[PDB]
mmCIF file of C-alpha atoms in Angstrom:
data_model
loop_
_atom_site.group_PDB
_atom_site.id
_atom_site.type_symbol
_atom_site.label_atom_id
_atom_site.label_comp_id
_atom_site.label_asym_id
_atom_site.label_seq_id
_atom_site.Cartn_x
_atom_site.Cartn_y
_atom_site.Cartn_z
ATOM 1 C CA UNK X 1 85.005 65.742 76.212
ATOM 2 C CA UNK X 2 87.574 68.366 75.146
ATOM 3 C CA UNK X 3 91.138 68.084 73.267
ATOM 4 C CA UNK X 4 93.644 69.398 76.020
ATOM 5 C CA UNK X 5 96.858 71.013 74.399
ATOM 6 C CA UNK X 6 99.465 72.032 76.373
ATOM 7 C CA UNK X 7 101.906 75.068 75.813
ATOM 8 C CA UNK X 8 105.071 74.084 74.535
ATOM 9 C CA UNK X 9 108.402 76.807 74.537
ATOM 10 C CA UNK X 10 108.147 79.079 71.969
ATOM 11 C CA UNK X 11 104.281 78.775 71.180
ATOM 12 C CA UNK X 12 102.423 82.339 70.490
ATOM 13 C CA UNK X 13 99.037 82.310 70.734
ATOM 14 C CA UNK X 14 98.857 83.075 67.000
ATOM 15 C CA UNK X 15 101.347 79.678 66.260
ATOM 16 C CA UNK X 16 99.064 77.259 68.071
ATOM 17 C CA UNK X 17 95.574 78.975 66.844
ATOM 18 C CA UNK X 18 97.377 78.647 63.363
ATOM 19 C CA UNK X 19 98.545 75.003 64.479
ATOM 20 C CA UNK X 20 94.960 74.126 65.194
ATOM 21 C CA UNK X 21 93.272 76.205 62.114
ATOM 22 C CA UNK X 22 91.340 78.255 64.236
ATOM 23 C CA UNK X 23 90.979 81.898 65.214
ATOM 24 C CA UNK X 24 93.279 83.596 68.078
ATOM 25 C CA UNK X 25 89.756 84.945 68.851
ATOM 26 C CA UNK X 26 87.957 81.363 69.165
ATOM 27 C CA UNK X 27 91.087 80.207 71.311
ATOM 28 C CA UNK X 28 90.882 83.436 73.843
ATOM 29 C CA UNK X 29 87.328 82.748 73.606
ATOM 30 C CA UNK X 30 87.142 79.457 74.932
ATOM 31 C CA UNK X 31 90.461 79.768 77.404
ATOM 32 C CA UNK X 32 89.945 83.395 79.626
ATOM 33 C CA UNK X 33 93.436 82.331 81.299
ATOM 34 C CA UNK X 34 95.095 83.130 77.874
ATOM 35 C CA UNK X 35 94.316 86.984 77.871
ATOM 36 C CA UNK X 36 97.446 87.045 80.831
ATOM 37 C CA UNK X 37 99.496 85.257 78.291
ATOM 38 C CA UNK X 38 100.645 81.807 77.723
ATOM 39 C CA UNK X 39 103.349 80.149 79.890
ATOM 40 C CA UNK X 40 105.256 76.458 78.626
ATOM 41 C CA UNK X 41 103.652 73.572 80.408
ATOM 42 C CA UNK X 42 100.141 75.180 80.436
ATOM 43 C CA UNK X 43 96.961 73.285 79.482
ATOM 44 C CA UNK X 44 94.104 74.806 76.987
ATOM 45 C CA UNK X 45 91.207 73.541 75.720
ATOM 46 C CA UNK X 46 90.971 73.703 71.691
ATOM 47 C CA UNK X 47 87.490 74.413 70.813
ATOM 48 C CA UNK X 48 85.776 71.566 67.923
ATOM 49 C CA UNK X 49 87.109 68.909 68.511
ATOM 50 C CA UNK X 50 86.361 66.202 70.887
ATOM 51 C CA UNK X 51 89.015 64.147 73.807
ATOM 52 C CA UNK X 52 91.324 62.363 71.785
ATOM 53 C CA UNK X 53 91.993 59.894 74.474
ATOM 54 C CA UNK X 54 88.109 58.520 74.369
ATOM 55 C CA UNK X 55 89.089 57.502 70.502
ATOM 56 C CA UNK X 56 90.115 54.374 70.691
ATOM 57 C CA UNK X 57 92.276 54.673 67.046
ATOM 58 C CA UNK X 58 95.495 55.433 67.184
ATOM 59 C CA UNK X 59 98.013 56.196 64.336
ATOM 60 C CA UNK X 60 101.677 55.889 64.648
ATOM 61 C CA UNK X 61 104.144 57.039 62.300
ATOM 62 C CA UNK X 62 107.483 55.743 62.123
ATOM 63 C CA UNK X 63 109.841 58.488 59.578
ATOM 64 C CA UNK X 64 113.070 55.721 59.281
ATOM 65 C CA UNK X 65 110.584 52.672 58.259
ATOM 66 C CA UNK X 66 108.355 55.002 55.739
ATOM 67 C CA UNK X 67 105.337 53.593 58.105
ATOM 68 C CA UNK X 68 102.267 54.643 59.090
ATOM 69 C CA UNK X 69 100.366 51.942 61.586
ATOM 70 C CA UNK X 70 96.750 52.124 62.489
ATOM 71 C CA UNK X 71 95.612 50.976 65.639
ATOM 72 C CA UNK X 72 91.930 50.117 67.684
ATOM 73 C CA UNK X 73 92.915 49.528 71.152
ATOM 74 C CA UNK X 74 96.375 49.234 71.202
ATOM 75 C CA UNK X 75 96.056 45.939 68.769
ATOM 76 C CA UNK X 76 97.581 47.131 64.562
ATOM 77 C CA UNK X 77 94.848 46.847 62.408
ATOM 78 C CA UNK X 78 96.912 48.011 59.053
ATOM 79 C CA UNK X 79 100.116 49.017 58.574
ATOM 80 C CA UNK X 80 100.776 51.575 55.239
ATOM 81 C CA UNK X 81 104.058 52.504 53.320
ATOM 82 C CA UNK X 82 104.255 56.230 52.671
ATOM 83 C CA UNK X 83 106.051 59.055 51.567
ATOM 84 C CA UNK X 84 108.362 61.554 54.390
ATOM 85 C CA UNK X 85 110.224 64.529 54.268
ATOM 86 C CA UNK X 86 113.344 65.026 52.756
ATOM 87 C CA UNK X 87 116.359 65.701 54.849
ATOM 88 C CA UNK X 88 116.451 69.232 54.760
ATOM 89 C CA UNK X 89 112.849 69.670 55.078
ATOM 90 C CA UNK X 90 111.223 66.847 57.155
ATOM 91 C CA UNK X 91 108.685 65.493 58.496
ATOM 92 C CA UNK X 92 108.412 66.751 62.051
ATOM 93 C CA UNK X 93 108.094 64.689 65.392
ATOM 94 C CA UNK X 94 105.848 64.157 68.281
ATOM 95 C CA UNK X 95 102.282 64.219 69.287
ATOM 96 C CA UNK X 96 100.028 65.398 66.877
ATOM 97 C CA UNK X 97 96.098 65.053 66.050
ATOM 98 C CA UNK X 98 94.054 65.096 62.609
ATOM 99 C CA UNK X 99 92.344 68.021 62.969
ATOM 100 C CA UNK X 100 90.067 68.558 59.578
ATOM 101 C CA UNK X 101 89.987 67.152 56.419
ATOM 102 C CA UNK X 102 88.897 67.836 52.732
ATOM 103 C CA UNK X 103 88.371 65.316 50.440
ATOM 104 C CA UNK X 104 89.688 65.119 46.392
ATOM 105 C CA UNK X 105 91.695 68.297 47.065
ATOM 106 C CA UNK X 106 93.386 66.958 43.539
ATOM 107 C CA UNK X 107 97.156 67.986 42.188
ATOM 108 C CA UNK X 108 100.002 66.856 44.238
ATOM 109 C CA UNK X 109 97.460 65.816 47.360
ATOM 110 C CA UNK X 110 95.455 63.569 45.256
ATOM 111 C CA UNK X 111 92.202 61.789 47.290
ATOM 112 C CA UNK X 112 92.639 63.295 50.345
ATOM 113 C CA UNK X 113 93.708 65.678 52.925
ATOM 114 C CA UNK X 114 94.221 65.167 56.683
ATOM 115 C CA UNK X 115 94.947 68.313 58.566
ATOM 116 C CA UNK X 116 97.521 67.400 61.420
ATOM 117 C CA UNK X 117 97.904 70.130 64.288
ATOM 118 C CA UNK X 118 101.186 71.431 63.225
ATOM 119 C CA UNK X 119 100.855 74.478 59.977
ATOM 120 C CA UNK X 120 101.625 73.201 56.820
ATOM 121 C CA UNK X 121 101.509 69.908 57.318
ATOM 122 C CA UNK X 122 99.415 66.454 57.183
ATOM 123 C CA UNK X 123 98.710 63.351 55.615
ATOM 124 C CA UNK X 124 97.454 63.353 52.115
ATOM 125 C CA UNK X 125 97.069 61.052 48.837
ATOM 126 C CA UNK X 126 99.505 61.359 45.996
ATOM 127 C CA UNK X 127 99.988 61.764 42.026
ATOM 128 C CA UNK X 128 102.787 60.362 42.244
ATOM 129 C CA UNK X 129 102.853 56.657 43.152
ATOM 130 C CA UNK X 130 106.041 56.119 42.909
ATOM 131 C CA UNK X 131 106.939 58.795 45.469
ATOM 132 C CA UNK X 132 105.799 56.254 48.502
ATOM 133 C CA UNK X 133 108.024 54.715 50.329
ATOM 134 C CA UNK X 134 110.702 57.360 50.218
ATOM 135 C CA UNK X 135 112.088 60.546 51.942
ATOM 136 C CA UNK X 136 111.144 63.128 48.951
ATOM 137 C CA UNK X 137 108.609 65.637 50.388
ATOM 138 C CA UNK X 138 108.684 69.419 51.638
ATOM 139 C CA UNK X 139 107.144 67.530 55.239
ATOM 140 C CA UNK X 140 103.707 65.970 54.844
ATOM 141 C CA UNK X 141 103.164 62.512 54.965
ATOM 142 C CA UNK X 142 101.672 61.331 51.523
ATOM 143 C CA UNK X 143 99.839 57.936 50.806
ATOM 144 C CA UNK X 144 98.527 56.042 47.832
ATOM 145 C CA UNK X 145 95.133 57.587 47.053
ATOM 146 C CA UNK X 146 93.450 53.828 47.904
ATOM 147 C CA UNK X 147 95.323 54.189 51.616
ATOM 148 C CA UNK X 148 94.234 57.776 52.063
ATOM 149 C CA UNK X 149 90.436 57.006 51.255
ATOM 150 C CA UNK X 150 90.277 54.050 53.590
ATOM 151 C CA UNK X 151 92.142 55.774 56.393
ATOM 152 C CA UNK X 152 90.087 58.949 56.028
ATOM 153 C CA UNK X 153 87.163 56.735 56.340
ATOM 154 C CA UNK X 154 88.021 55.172 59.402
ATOM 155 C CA UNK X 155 89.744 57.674 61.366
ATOM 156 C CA UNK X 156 87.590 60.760 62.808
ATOM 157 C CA UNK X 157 88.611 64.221 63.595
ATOM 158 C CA UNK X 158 90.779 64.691 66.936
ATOM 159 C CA UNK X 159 92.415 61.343 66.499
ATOM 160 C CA UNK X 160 96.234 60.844 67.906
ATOM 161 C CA UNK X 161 98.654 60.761 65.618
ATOM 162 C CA UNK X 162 102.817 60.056 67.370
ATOM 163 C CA UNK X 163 105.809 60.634 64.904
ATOM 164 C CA UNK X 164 108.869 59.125 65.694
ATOM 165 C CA UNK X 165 111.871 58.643 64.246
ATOM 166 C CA UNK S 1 83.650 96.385 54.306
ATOM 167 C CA UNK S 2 83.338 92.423 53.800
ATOM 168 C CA UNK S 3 85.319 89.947 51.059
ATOM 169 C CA UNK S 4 82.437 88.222 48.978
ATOM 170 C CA UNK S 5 83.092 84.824 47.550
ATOM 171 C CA UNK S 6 80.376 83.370 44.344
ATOM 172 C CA UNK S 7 80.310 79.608 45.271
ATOM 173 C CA UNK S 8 81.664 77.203 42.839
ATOM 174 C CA UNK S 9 79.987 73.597 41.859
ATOM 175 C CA UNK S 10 81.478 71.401 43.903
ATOM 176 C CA UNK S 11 82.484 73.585 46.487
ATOM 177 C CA UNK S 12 81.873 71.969 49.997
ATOM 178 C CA UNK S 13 82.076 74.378 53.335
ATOM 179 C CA UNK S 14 85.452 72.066 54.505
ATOM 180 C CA UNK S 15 86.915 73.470 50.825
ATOM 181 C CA UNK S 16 85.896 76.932 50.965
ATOM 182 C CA UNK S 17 86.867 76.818 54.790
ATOM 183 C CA UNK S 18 90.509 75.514 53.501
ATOM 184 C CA UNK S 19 90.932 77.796 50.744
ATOM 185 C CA UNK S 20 90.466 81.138 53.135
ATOM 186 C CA UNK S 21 91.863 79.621 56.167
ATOM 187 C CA UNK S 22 88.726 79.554 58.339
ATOM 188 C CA UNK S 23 87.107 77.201 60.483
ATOM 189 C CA UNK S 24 83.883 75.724 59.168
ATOM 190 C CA UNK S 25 82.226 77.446 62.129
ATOM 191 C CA UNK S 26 83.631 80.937 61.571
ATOM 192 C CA UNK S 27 82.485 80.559 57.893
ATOM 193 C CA UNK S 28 79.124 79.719 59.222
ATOM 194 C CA UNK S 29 78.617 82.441 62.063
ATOM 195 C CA UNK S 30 78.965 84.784 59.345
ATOM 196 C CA UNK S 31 76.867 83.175 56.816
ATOM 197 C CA UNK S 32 74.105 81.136 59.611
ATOM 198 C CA UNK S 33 72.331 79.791 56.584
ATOM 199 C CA UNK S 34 74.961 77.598 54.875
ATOM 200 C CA UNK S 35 74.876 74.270 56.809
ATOM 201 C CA UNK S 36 71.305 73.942 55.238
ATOM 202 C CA UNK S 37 73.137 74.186 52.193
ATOM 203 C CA UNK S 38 75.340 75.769 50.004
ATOM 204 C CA UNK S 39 74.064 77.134 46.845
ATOM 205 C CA UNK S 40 76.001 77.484 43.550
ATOM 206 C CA UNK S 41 76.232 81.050 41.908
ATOM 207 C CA UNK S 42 74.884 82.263 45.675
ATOM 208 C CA UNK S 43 77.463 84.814 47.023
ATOM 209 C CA UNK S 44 78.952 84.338 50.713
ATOM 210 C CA UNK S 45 81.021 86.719 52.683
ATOM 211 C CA UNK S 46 84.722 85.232 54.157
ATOM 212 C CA UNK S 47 85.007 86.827 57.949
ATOM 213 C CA UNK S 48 88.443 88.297 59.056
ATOM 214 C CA UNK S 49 88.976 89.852 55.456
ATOM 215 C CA UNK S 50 88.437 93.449 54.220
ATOM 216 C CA UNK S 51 86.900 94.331 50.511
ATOM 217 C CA UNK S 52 90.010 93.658 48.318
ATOM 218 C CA UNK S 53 88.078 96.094 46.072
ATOM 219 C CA UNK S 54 88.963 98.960 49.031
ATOM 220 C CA UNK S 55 93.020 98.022 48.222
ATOM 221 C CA UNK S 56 94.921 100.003 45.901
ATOM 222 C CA UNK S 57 97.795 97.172 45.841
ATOM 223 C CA UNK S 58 97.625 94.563 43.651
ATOM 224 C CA UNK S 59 99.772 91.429 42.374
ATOM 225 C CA UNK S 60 100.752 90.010 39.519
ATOM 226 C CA UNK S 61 102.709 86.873 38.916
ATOM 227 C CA UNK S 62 103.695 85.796 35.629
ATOM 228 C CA UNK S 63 104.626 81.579 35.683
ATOM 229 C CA UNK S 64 106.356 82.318 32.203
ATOM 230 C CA UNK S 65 108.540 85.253 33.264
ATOM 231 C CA UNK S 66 108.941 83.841 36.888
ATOM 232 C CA UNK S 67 108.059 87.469 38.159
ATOM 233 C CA UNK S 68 106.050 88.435 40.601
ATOM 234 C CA UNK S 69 104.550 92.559 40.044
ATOM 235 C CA UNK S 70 103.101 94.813 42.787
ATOM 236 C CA UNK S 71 101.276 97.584 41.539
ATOM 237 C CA UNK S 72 99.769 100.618 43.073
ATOM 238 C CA UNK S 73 96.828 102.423 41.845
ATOM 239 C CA UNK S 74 97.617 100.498 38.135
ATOM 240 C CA UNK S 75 101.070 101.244 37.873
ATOM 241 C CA UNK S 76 103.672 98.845 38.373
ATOM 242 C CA UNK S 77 105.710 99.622 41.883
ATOM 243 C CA UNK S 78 108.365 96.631 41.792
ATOM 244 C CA UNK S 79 108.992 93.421 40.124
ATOM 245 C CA UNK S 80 110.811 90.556 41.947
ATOM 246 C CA UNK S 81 112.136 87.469 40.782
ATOM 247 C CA UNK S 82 110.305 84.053 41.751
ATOM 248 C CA UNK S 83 110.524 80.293 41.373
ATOM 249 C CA UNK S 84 107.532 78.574 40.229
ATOM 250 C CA UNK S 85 105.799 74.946 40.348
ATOM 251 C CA UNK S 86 107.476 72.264 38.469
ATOM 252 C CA UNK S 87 105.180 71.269 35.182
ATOM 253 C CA UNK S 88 103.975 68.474 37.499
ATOM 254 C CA UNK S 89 103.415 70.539 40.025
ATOM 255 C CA UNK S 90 102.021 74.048 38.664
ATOM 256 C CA UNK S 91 101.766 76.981 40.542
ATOM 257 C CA UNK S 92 97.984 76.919 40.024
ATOM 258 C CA UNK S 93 96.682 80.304 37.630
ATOM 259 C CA UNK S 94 93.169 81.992 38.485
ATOM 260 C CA UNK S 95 92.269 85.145 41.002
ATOM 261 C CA UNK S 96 93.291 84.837 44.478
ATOM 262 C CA UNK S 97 93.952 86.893 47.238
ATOM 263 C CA UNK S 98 96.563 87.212 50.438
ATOM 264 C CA UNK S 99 94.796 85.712 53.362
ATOM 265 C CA UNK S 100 97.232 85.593 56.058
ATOM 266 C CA UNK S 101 100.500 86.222 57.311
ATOM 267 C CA UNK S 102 103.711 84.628 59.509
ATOM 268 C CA UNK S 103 106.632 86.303 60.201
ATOM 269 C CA UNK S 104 109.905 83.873 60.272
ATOM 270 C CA UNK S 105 108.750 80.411 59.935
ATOM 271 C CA UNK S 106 111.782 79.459 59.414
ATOM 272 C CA UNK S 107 112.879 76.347 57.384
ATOM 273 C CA UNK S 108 112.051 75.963 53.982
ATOM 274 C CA UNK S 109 109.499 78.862 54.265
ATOM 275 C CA UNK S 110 112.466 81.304 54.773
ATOM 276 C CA UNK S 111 111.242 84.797 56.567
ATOM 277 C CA UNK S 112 107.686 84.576 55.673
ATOM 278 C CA UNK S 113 104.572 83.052 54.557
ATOM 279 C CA UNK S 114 101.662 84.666 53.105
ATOM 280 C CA UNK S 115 98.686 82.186 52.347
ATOM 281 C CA UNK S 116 96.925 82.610 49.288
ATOM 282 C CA UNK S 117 93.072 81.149 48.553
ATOM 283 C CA UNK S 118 94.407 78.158 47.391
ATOM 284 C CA UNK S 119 94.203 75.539 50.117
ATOM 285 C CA UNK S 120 98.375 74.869 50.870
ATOM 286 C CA UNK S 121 99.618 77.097 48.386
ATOM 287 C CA UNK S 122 101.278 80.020 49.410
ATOM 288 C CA UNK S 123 103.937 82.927 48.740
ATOM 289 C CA UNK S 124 107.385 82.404 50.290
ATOM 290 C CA UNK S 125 110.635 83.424 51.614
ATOM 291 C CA UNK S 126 113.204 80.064 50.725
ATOM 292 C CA UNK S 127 116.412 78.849 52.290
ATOM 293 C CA UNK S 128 117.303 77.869 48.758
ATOM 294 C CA UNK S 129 117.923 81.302 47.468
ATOM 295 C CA UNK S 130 119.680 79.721 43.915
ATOM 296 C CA UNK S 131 116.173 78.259 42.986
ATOM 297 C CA UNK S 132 114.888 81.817 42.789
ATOM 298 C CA UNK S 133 114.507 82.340 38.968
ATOM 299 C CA UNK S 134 113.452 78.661 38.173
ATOM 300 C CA UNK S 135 110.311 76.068 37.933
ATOM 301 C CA UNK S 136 111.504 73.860 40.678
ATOM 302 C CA UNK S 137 109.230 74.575 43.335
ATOM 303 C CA UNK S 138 106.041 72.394 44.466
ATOM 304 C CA UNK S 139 103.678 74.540 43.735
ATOM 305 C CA UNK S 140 104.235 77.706 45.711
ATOM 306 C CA UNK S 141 105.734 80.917 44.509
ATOM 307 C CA UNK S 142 109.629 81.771 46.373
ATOM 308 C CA UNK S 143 111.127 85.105 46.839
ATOM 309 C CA UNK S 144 113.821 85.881 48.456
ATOM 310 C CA UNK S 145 113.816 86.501 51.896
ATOM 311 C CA UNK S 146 115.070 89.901 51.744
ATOM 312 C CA UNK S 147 111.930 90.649 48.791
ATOM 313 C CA UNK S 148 109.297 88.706 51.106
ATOM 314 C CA UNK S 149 109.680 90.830 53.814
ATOM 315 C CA UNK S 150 109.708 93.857 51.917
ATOM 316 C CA UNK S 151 106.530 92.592 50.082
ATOM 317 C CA UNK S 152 104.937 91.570 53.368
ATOM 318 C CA UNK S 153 105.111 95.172 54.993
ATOM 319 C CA UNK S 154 103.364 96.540 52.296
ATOM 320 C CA UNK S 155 100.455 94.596 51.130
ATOM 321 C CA UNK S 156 97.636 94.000 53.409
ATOM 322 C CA UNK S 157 95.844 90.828 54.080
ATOM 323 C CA UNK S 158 92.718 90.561 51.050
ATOM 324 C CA UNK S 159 95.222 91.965 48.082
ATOM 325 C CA UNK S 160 94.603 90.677 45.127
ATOM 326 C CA UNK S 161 96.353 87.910 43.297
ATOM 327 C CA UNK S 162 96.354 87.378 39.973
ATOM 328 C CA UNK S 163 98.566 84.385 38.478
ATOM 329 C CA UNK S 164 98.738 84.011 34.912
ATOM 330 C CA UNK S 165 101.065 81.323 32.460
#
């Protein structure tokens, strides 16, 4: 299948390219409809990554319980404690996906990286242990390295991730 | 006119991809050999990039002096103040180069955001202006917004960046 993204207010087709870490060109490429523009409410395909309704893991992040829950089917598998953004610089909300990932990026992102499918941001380890569990980033979500690995692990590209409050 | 990059040990595609803000699949339709394996010492062109070698600008950012130095044709043009990485989270030192560009992302990034070939590390405008002058940051180099956008209309994408203690 494909990973349907619709157009939200104030998207360019640069932002949501840039959101998805892809080329304006790839985009245009695979969505003809997009050289007459974009318009809110409008559904394009973003090319690489597969439906993330047909994967049946879910991750839910909850910002005021410093929570991030894995699920298979609806049913929590693990729930993890992590790190959110501070108050002036947070963590934002909604629908997101992982969309890439490198592994042992090292520094401040320690074990891993998760790209999520807003710039800037995603879910990454830490060098800082005792950072988790409190509202002290620039955004991303970070996670002991040992929560990172396995998550990474289990998790593929185009998954659902929801923020909420 | 084509940016050249000597592979590293240890580099994987997903970290080269990251560092010059590529997909893995752009990387690879301009080098079609890669996924067979990536070679150590073996040059690779980045796509989207021009020669930095063609550009007569060129930056210089001192973590000591907490300047940043654009020079033209070897002589110095303008020095701007900067904040730096905290010593646990160092502005990382090497060669890079400006990959990309966004105009008013707002936030913490302040009026731009230029991405350097360090995977998440970037230049900056702030919304902190009194941390200009100071090793406070996360890693990423602040100007303020006013010297950002200045900067940012004058060097292209693939200038040089060199960041030195």
């Amino acid at each position: 299948g494909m990973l349907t993204y619709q157009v939200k207010q104030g998207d360019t087709l640069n932002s949501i390219a840039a959101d998805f870490r892809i080329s304006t060109a790839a985009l245009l490429q695979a969505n003809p409809s997009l050289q007459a523009g974009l318009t809110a409410g409008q559904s394009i395909v973003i090319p690489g990554l597969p439906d993330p309704y047909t994967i049946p893991y879910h991750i839910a992040v909850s910002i005021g319980a410093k929570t991030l829950t894995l699920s298979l089917n609806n049913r929590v598998m693990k729930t993890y404690p992590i790190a959110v953004g501070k108050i002036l610089t947070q963590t934002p909300t909604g629908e997101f996906y992982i969309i890439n990932r490198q592994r042992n990026p090292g520094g401040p992102f320690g074990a891993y990286w998760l790209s999520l499918s807003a710039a800037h941001y995603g879910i990454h380890g830490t060098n800082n242990p005792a950072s988790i569990g409190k509202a002290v980033s620039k955004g991303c979500i970070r996670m002991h390295n040992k929560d990172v690995i396995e998550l990474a692990s289990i998790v593929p590209n185009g998954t659902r991730v929801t923020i909420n409050r």
